[PDB]
């Protein structure tokens, strides 16, 4: 007999009064990559040769992550 | 007999009165990479040759992570 | 008989009156990497040759991590 | 009685057997300048706030400069 | 009586068998300048706030400078 | 009576068998300058706040400078 019965009533919350006046200003750059062969198998995530700029300004941006597992 | 019955009532919380006047200003740069062969198998996460800039300004940005496991 | 019954009532909290006037100003730079062969298997996380800049300014930024395990 | 009679018979010369395989590769950068007032008079040469790249490969590039003056 | 009669028969010379395989690779950078007032008069040469890169590869690049003056 | 009669028969010379395999690789940097007032008169040469890179590879690069002056 198994009674798998977890209970969650928890909270993740925020208040912010004002959000702004943010400046992101990159000055370029240079990237070089050389290879002869690539061979990727079975759940590969790959990034080769990048020059990436990100500005991320969510009003909340809170995260909650859950995982339930039962195995025989 | 197994009675797996955890209980969660917890809180994660924030208040911020004003959020701003943020300046991110990078001055370029240079990157070089050389290989003969790449060979990736089975749950590989890879990053090769980057010049990446991030500005991240969440109004909350709080995190909660939970994990429940039972095994026979 | 097993009675796995933990209880959580905890708080994680912040108050901030004003957050700002932040300057991030990197002065470039240079990176070089050389390899013959790369060979990655089974749950590899890898980063090769980078010049990466991050500005991270959460209004809260609190973390809570939990893990429950039972095994036979 | 002034006899002003300079004589020039001189030479400036070069040989180069082969000229090439030159790589110029700049990685960005950042420049900022602030002023309230500017006031320039009478033979001013000025340069304010620059990010300049030059490649100069003349097959000779030899120079000769002469100046003759007589004054009463 | 004045007899100003200089004589020049001089030589400036070069030989170069092969010129090349030159790499110029700058990694960015950052410059900031602040002023209230600038006031320039009468034969001023000025440079304010720069990030300048030069590659110069003349096949000869020889220089000769001459100056003759007579005054009463 | 004045007889200003110098004679020049001089040589400036070079031989080079091969010139090359030169790498110039600067790693960025940072410069800041602050002033209230600048006030320049009569034959001023000025440089304020710079991050400048030079690669100079003349095949000859020889220099000769002469100056002849007579005054009453």
Numbering used by the authors:
A (entry chain F), B (entry chain E), C (entry chain C), D (entry chain A), E (entry chain D), F (entry chain B): 307 to 378
From the paper:
The assembly of tau into amyloid filaments is associated with more than twenty neurodegenerative diseases, collectively termed tauopathies. Here, we describe twelve phosphomimetic, serine/threonine to aspartate, mutations in tau, which we termed PAD12, that collectively induce the *in vitro* assembly of full-length tau into filaments with the same structure as that of paired helical filaments extracted from the brains of individuals with Alzheimer’s disease. The tau sequence ([Fig fig1]) comprises an amino-terminal projection domain (residues 1-150), a proline-rich region (residues 151-243), four microtubule-binding repeats (R1-R4; residues 244-368) and a carboxy-terminal domain (residues 369-441). The tau folds of AD and CTE comprise residues from R3 and R4 and the carboxy-terminal domain.
Next, we investigated whether AD brain-derived tau filaments could seed the assembly of PAD12 tau, and if this seeding could be sustained over more than one round. We introduced sonicated AD brain-derived tau filaments to a solution of 40 mM (∼1.5 mg/mL) 0N3R-PAD12 tau and performed *in vitro* assembly under orbital shaking at 500 rpm (2 min on; 1 min off) for 48 h in a buffer containing 20 mM HEPES at pH 7.3, 4 mM potassium phosphate at pH 7.2, 300 mM sodium citrate and 4 mM TCEP. Under the same conditions, but without the addition of AD seeds, we observed no filament formation within 48 hrs. Although we only used extracts from 0.8 mg of AD brain tissue for reactions that contained 60 mg of recombinant (unlabelled) PAD12 tau, we observed no lag phase in Thioflavin T (ThT) fluorescence upon addition of the seeds. Instead, ThT fluorescence increased linearly directly after the seeds were added and fluorescence plateaued after 48 h (**[Fig fig4]**). The seeded filaments were shown to be PHFs, but they were not capable of seeding the assembly of wildtype 0N3R tau in a second round of seeded assembly. To test whether this is also the case for PAD12 tau, we used filaments from the first round at an estimated ratio of 1:2,500 to recombinant (unlabelled) PAD12 tau for a second round of seeded assembly. We again observed a linear increase in ThT fluorescence directly after addition of the seeds, and cryo-EM analysis of the seeded aggregates still showed PHFs (**[Fig fig4]**), indicating that PAD12 tau can be used for multiple rounds of seeded aggregation. For example, AD-seeded PAD12 tau filaments can be used as seeds in a second round of *in vitro* seeded assembly, whereas AD-seeded unmodified tau filaments were reported to be seeding-incompetent, even though both tau constructs formed PHFs in the first round of seeding.
